[PDB]
Amino acid sequence: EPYVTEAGREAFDKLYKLHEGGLQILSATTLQPQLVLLEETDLVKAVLNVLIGVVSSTFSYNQALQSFAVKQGVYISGTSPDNVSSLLTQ
Amino acid sequence: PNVLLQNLCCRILGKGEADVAQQFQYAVRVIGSNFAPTVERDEFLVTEKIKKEFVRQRREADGALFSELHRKLQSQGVLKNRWSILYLLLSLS
Amino acid sequence: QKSPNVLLQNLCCRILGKGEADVAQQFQYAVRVIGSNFAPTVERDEFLVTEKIKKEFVRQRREADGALFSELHRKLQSQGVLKNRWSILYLLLSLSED
Amino acid sequence: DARSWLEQHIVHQYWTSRAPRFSHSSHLHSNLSAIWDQHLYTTDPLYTPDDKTIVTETQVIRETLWLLSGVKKLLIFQLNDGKVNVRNDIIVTHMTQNCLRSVLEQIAAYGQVVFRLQKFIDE
Amino acid sequence: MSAVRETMDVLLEISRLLNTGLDMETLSICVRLCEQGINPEALSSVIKELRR
Amino acid sequence: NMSAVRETMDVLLEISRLLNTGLDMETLSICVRLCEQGINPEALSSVIKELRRASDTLK
Amino acid sequence: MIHELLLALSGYPGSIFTWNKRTGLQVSQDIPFLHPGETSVLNRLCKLGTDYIRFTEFIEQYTGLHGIYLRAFCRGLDSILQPYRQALLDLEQEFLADPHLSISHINYSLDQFHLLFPSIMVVVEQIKSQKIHGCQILETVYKHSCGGLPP
Amino acid sequence: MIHELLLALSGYPGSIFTWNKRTGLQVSQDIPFLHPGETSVLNRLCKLGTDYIRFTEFIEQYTGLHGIYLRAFCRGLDSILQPYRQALLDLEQEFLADPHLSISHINYSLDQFHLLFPSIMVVVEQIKSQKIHGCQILETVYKHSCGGLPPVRSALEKTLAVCHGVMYKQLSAWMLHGLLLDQYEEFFVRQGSLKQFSLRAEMLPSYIPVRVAEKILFVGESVQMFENQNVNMSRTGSILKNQEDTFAAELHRLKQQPLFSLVDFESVLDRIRSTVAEHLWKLMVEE
Amino acid sequence: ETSLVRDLLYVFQGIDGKFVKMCNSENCYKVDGKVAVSKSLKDITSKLSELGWLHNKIKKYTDQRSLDRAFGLVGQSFCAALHQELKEYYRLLSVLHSQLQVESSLTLRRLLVWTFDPKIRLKTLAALVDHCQGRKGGELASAVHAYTKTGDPYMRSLVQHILGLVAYPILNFLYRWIYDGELEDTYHEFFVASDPVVKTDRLWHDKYSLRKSMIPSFMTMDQSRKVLLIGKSINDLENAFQTKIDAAYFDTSKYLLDVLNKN
């Protein structure tokens, strides 16, 4: 019978938004963080692009450190939210 | 009425239209002049004819089995006019 | 039957000494009181309640009757029809009189 | 709203009470408990209607699956790690409370051994 | 819908026992004629010819 | 069953009498049925005292 | 839930799989819609992500106490992670195939790494607490392999 | 009433089904919302669930005299209840198909079991009131199938076959190199050179004659005396004969029987007393 | 009314109704206490009561089926055959009640045709238990031998089922003794009793006899004496029995010719 585990990844994404929401109140300035698109396909094309000296939308070249910078705020990573955000840094 | 009866010719004969036409004519004539039942309505009489048919053939086990099957048909509560359905299947045994 | 509503009416009818429909006005008043929450002074341990009843007996100068009470307590425990013995015991303790 | 979406795509909660509750089916012999309770409540002058955790019919076999090999169960009480037993409030609608207790007490005592045998495992 | 499927299954079983030689399609048509208040006597006669 | 409930009543009844009560056997039965059906012990005790008091003012 | 858990066990924290540097990687207590029972088996999987980031810091600290058999011991430690990371990847292609899965399936597949990992975690802490280096590294791993457990 | 009766018959009590624990016969309640007739038939379908739990109690008791044929007979006995537990679960789907089936349907179906279960109650009873053990368990079951009824005669020769397999291992190990298995001392071959061997006439069947017993004795004693002396002189060999493999295959072939073949058992008492018996005969010739 | 249509069902299983009775061995007549204007629809259900009476004589027979081991080997094989037809009798009670719970009311006269087919069957089982009071084998073989000569084709079918299972222990005795010379007795229910004096080495000597007073009537008297000679020398399906003892007699005489070769 569908549980959180048996329902899917998408169920986890809805829940993740909900779980967040409580903590987002105090990280709020006067409004809470909002979600930002990337698809699953946008990541697997980007992973090859940082490794040749090129930027994509995810990757922001910083010319005052000569290092790449990913979007620091919440990016929804398809159905795998904010775990990829940390994986994409290494 | 008109469609269903034509459908009957088509599935049995395994032919479409303009092949079953003469057959249609017999069928139409014979159904229409005797449309409504010419027997007094009664589920029980038809059922008994089916079970006697089983006994006469010495198929006792199936005669008992049948009794279970008629209760199942009746219970679902979908088809009414049941006697005529049963009647038909008995005539064509 | 024995729904709460039906049982609270029967109680009121006999104690007020008036008919069924003539205890209504008090019957409504009775529902508000029970539906407003309270919490007992003794909330934990079945034993804490029993020792209290037992202390009361001594106080009233009826030591012998508290011995008899211990004996009754064993009887109640063994039959097992009731699963909220404590409510019944706190309730009589409160309505104690001389 | 997200909370409501979860609540429909996941089966309704029965470890915390904050999800509405089924124990209906159209068969006549599957609402047996509602019939059994009613009988007790009129025959016995002294009947104590328990506060029952409404389960969630034939999901008791999923808790038998976990219990027999896998993890400690925090949905049911275990007095210790060598004593598995089954809470006195579990009802399935197509049996009595008592009748239910009796199948779950066989697997409880069979999961008592695998759980005990798991405490011997030194990694 | 479901009860309508279950009921047809019962009828198919009634057909196998009596050796009618009516398929799932032929039986379903027959039923439909039967439900509209056609005399079974007439209906049986037509069928025999259609098999010829 | 009939026997068992009687004995359950019987013991409670003995305790109520020692402690002195103004309730009869019938009322006492009703109280227990309330106890089994939930109902914290303080609300029950209060409703009784107010109802006992009102009866004296009337009679 | 299923696939997002795989990233917690290759050492990448969500805010659901929170990393604490005391008690380790742990599932956050009674979060909405997570069965009592599923948090218990998800916590046994998080001990195999706790000792896995306690192992990848032990490589990067001593590559790229001092010693030159210490860093030979680090390429000794990377070889036991080799079947682990393949079995995280064989879960990965299954959960891209369909999204309905039970966590009992990861419980079943990664218990094998629940009896290699505790028995090697005592090895690296014993190295760092007697402060030993060198050719007595070869002695330190050898007499444990004399010990029980075929894996 | 229907689902509490399906599982009370499987050995899991209700509390509208009340288990009075093998004293008396009140095993369903008096039920107000069924008819006065329907609570009377309910007790009848329950006596066939009471004698069913008298059987599952006898397995655990004799799975801890307490001999090993007592226990071969228990694991015989669990396979008679294998169509019983299978027909109860075949009934589960019959009551889901429509809720129009009641306990008069259950009567019809569960009388292929009222021709089996009282008759096997008497097998288990004569067992526990005489405290019988050994090969005379087989002799109880054999004298109980000496009775009629075609369901009880097919079944108790199947319960006989499982425990005659428990004999087949004894008497094959007895006539190999002379191994004697006794975990409680149950088998007819008694013990208490060549060593001592003797036969008990008080643990011997009536379908094994006296004169049949002594074909197993003399062969078994010959192999035993080479187990002391030297096993290159072994009549049955071990290095120098693969007759023991023929003997294994022969045993396995006959291990099962559809019921019980008497002629096949004693045919291989011939064969083990010849062929290999041409080896020690040519020693004592020359000696 | 609907409550009476159900009530008659229970009396078929031999289970006392929801009204008080003073009958259950007389018939199974019910007295409601308003039986007075129920004297036409109580009278219909008093004809159906008489079917439930005949069920109870077969049922109490089955309480004698299995004791701590009931007397006879054929006595219980008979009882097995009588329970089978009781089992089939239950099958129509199990459709009847399931019609009385559909979305109900089944007419008293409709169910009368339903009880008429059991009324020619169960009545001739209850007639067949009247001839037998003893269980001793071969008595039972004379009961079905006395009932398959009688008229009426409809119970002749029923007794031919019973012939096939009553007779089956007779034939299980017979074919072992012809071929190998081996016998079975459990109570002396075979028509061969053993040990008139004491056993003696074979040369043909008085050791077995026909033991008439428990002979199965399936065999005629010169054919029971034929199978006796066959069994010492080695040492309708009623009419198939005398054929193959003639084919046995030729195979056993080759064995008797082997005894001359030993002397």
Swiss-Prot record, chain E:
Protein's UniProt name: Mitotic-spindle organizing protein 1
GO biological process terms on file: gamma-tubulin complex localization; microtubule nucleation by interphase microtubule organizing center; mitotic spindle assembly
Assembly mode: Part of the gamma-tubulin complex.
Family: Belongs to the MOZART1 family.
Cellular component, GO annotation: centrosome; cytoplasm; gamma-tubulin ring complex; interphase microtubule organizing center; spindle
UniProt keyword Cytoplasm, yes or no: yes
Subcellular location field: Cytoplasm, Cytoskeleton, Microtubule organizing center, Centrosome; Cytoplasm, Cytoskeleton, Spindle
Highest taxon above the source species: Eukaryota
Subcellular location, principal: cytoplasm
Keywords, ordered alphabetically: Cytoplasm, Cytoskeleton
High-level lineage: Eukaryota, Metazoa, Chordata, Craniata, Vertebrata
UniProtKB/Swiss-Prot annotation, chain F:
Superkingdom as given in the UniProt entry: Eukaryota
Key words of the record: Cytoplasm, Cytoskeleton
GO cellular component: centrosome; cytoplasm; gamma-tubulin ring complex; interphase microtubule organizing center; spindle
BP GO annotations: gamma-tubulin complex localization; microtubule nucleation by interphase microtubule organizing center; mitotic spindle assembly
Subcellular location: Cytoplasm, Cytoskeleton, Microtubule organizing center, Centrosome; Cytoplasm, Cytoskeleton, Spindle
Membrane-spanning ranges: none
Membership in a protein family: Belongs to the MOZART1 family.
Biological role: Required for gamma-tubulin complex recruitment to the centrosome.
Assembly notes: Part of the gamma-tubulin complex.
Protein name, as recorded: Mitotic-spindle organizing protein 1
Organism: Xenopus laevis (African clawed frog)
From Swiss-Prot, chain I:
Function: Necessary for the recruitment of gamma-tubulin to the centrosome and for the formation of a functional centrosome.
UniProt subcellular location: Cytoplasm, Cytoskeleton, Microtubule organizing center, Centrosome
Complex formation: Interacts with gamma-tubulin.
Section of the entire sequence shown: 246 to 551 of 906
Family: Belongs to the TUBGCP family.
Protein name: Gamma-tubulin complex component 3 homolog
Gene symbol of the encoding locus: tubgcp3
